[PDB]
Structures are given as C-alpha cells and as structure tokens.
Amino acid sequence: SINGGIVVAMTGKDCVAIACDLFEKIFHYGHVFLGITGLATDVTTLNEMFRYKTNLYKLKEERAIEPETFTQLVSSSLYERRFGPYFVGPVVAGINSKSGKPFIAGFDLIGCIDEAKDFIVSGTASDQLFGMCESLYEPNLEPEDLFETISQALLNAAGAVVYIIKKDEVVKRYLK
C-alpha cells in the first residue's frame, strides 16, 4: 500500500536534508520543502491545498514564501480541520532567503509545531528512526556528511530519495 511510510528532515551547516522512503511524499513550494506522511488521499489533498495557498501568496506578495511563514501556514491550515483532521504527519524544511538560517519543523494531525533544531521524524517506525537519528546525528554536519548521516539513518530505519538543500541550489538523490 502507498499509504503511510516515513519522512525525515535533518539540519546541517547552511543546509538542510529531507528524505523519505517514497506516488511521492515530498513536495516543494519554491524554496520551502514539505514532506507529508499518512493517507495518500490526505497527502494529495494537502499538496493541492498548499499549492493553492502558496500560489496565491506568491501572487499577492510578489515574493516566495519563507519557510517559517510556510510553517505557520501549514500549522493554521491543519488546525482549520480541528474536527475530523487529515490523518497526516507533515514535515517542513527550508532555508530563509534573507538570513540563510536552515529551518526544519514537523507537525501533529492538528498542527502542533515541534520546530526542533536537530532533526524531525514522522510516521511509521518513528521510534526506531528517533533512536537512529539520536545516535548518528551530530551538530554542524557538512553537506556531504549530512547526506551520509541522513541517508544511512533512513536506510537503517527498516528505495529512498534525498534532497540536499543549499541556499542557492538543491541536490536530489536516490537510495536503494
């Protein structure tokens, strides 16, 4: 089944990583990347909704949404369906265009914000990957050391894709 699976995001120096075990579950709205686990119907509905919202944002503001503002947009859009939520675990990752601050966040079904600075995991096998990330992770990884850390952690969580995000470029990679 294509429902569920796992998404993880992780912070480096001047970079972030986001990865999932794969239909697709990582989306991007300009320079802000949203990973969503859960029901694939709800993943698709969230993708359509946040595409709508961020297109209207970009049209009204003449400006691409910043990851912190997109995080607040995701939070408020999830809470709107406080009763009968989407069965999803979204994760946002990105870098602020002005400050270059690498940013990650993750949410519950109703948009509580973790905003943890080190790493965020969601979905199936979350406690296994929490243990992996805690053990493997070290702060201030280089972009390629960050790639190795995220990709190895994901492979040991249980066919994967990795985005390495710089301020000015993004590298997309795949894993068996």
């Binding site: 300009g30 029901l39 109703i110 905003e115 990679r173 894993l175």
Partner: protein, 229 residues
C-alpha cells in the same frame, strides 16, 4: 465557517478499519514551566518553550492538547490586542480570563485546553487557572500538568505570604525541578517569566538547565539529478 467537521464520519469509518506553576508574590507573579515535550513515551522535542504570551504583561502556559492550547491562546491574545487598541488601555487579566473561559465554554470542553493565566495590570497582579470546560479559579500559587502534584507539594511546603521576587523565582524553579525529578513528562530546562506590577515582564528562557558519523561515500547512491525551483 469555523473549525470544520468535514471528515468526521470519514475518520470514524477509518478508525473502524509537563509541569507548570504560577507563584504570586508581594509585587508580581512568577510563572514557570519545564521544557520537555513528548509524543507517547518519546521525547519529541527537548527545550520546548511552554510559556505563551497573551499580552506584554499577560502570560500563559497550558496542558492538554498542545495545538488546542496554542490556538486558543493565540486567539485570545489577538482579541486582547484588539480590545486594548479599541479602548487605548493596557488590557486587564480579568478580561483575558473572561473571554478565554467564554471561548472554552462555547466549545463545551471539546477544545481540550487547560491553562494557567498570570499577569499584571493597572489593578495589580493576577493568577488564574482555566479548564477546558471553561471553569476558573483564582489562586496565590498554582500547578498544572502531570507533575502538578509534585510542584504543588513543593509550593505548599515552601510558599509563604510576601515572597520577594528572588524568593518567588527560587520557589517556582524549585517546584519545576521537583516536577522534572519526580514526573517523567517533565524534564530538561526550566523556563521562568517574572511580571512585576511596576515593571516590564522579565522572561527568563532556560533559567535552569539541570562520535558515530560515517565516512563520506558510505551510502550507495543509486543516481543523481538536479532539482531547481
């Protein structure tokens, strides 16, 4: 309009398939909380900041459904901001208490936010608790969360009338430490906010704070591509 119900029957069918304290003192009130956050047995985030601001001198901390406490706290902070602008007056803590309890009452307890609201206003310092059903009680000291019993034990052992600012901060941080040590849900750092009747509120983030990297090339890259945006 409002909070949607539009997947209630759907999600039903599919399902068929912390320590916080407030401490009033001789010229103010101290509110403090731990900074652990947990999902199930798992620490989702250490150093989570649990002290919310309703107004410059009205601050809040909550238990129950975190998203609910956040949403209601930011709604009431918006209403308090707008009312202060409308009346050109520094907002009263009794006004926040009133509108917060009337909001929670409107939702008949289905919005599961339990809160301690502390502040100073032109009429003095105030400290209140609010329950998700919309029931309130005033106090001179309060505790909330899974560690509420340990913190209340400390407050009741050491609280006294006419605490000073420093003695009140000490008492509050001792009660949070007792929570951290005795409750599993509490842990990591202690946050404190100090409101004095004549003074700017003094927020004190983390007032108390009680290799395996693999070599490059380890992971089997399958292929590469450039995504541009």
């Amino acid at each position: 309009a409002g909070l949607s119900f539009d997947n209630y029957q759907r999600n039903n069918f599919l399902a068929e398939n912390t320590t916080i304290v407030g401490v009033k003192f001789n010229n103010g009130v101290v509110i403090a909380a731990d900074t652990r956050s947990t999902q199930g047995p798992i620490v989702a985030d250490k150093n989570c900041a649990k002290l919310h601001r309703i107004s410059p001198k009205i601050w809040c901390a909550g238990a129950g459904t975190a998203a609910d406490t956040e949403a209601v706290t930011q709604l009431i902070g918006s209403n308090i901001e707008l009312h202060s602008l409308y009346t050109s007056r520094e907002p009263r803590v009794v006004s926040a208490l009133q509108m917060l309890k009337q909001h929670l009452f409107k939702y008949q307890g289905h919005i599961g936010a339990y809160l301690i609201v502390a502040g100073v206003d032109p009429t003095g310092s105030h400290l209140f608790s609010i329950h998700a059903h919309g029931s309130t009680d005033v106090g001179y000291y309060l505790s909330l969360g899974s560690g509420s019993l340990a913190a209340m034990a400390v407050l009741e052992s050491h609280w006294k009338q006419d605490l000073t600012k420093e003695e009140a901060i000490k008492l509050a941080s001792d009660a949070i430490q007792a929570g951290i040590w005795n409750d599993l849900g509490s842990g990591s750092n202690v946050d404190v906010c100090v409101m004095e009747i004549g003074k700017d509120a003094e927020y004190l983030r983390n007032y108390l704070t009680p290799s395996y990297k693999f070599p490059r090339g380890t992971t089997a890259v399958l292929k590469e591509s450039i995504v541009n945006i």
